[PDB]
């Protein structure tokens, strides 16, 4: 393991072979989840880029976050998908935090601290365990099958993920940069592989 504190991955040029892979000790099926991460890129209103991907042996889009051109953020689970609309686009580092629950079937999507309206999606359905969490490129299969058009060019870091659902106070503390303890993917005790042109450099954002 290693501590990525005050560190960030950098993808210099667009391609279809540079990517990192994050491993997890998960063993039992998931009935809820929450993820949080910071990222910064200039793609903006030029093309769509992948943010976070989570596939399995029978589904390429078990969990996925995308930036649909002129549409806004797209959050998809187990095939089904919803799209949170953003009217205008800026150029600055952004922090996002999404959470989903099975029984309730409600999705929450906090962007830059402010919350968005709640929505329903995929009520009563579980998520597999064997997973391949690739970062940098969207996947249409468990392994590679990347598409260069959907690659990401920029910086990303501070990737955390809990199995249960956080509360608004907890999310606010996360945003302010306080202590906490993940249980699935911990940025302070990460374990990863990397291939291609990927660099590790200090994070620009505060």
């Amino acid at each position, epitope marked *: 393991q290693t501590d990525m504190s005050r560190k960030a991955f950098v993808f210099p040029k667009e391609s279809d072979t540079s990517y990192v892979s994050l491993k997890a000790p998960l063993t039992k099926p998931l009935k809820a989840f929450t993820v949080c991460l910071h990222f910064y890129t200039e793609l903006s209103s030029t093309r769509g880029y992948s943010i976070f991907s989570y596939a399995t042996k029978r589904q390429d889009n078990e969990i996925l976050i995308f930036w649909s051109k002129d*549409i806004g953020y797209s959050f998809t689970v187990g095939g089904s998908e919803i*799209l949170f609309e953003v009217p205008e686009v800026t150029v600055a580092p952004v922090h996002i935090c999404t959470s989903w629950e099975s029984a309730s079937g409600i999705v929450e999507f906090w962007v830059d601290g402010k919350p968005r309206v709640r929505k329903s999606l995929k009520k009563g359905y579980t998520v597999g365990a064997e997973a391949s969490i690739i970062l940098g490129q969207e996947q249409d299969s468990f392994g590679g099958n990347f598409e260069g058009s959907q690659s990401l060019v920029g910086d990303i870091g501070n990737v955390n993920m809990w199995d249960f659902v956080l509360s608004p106070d907890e999310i606010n503390t996360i945003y302010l940069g306080g202590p906490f303890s993940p249980n699935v993917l911990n940025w302070r005790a990460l374990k990863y592989e990397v291939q291609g042109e990927v660099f590790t450099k200090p994070q620009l954002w505060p």
Partner: nanobody
Amino acid sequence: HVQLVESGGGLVLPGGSLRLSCEASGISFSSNAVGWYRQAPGNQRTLVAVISSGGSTVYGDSVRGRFTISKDNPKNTAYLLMNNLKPEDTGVYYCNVDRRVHALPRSQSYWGRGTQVTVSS
């Protein structure tokens, strides 16, 4: 294989209404998103109304709050109800399906023949 069948189209006098149906086979709307695109100069399809698998929908800027689109998984059919159409709305319409709403269409996305609509007075 995959076949897309369009129905419910024609010509009507100004101010009337109509309804389009884009039935599909082989593919399933449960894990896909559908949408209707208009004709324009060159090869530029223009966004009209699209419904994603989850349920969220996106309507065209000009047609904001004019028509209503809806879907039905049981019979896997999408219906677009057009009402209060002006003469300029006449032209060529297509209904396509793709794994995810993608604004400006993409190559792989099936197109599904087409249809003609006239707003002749």
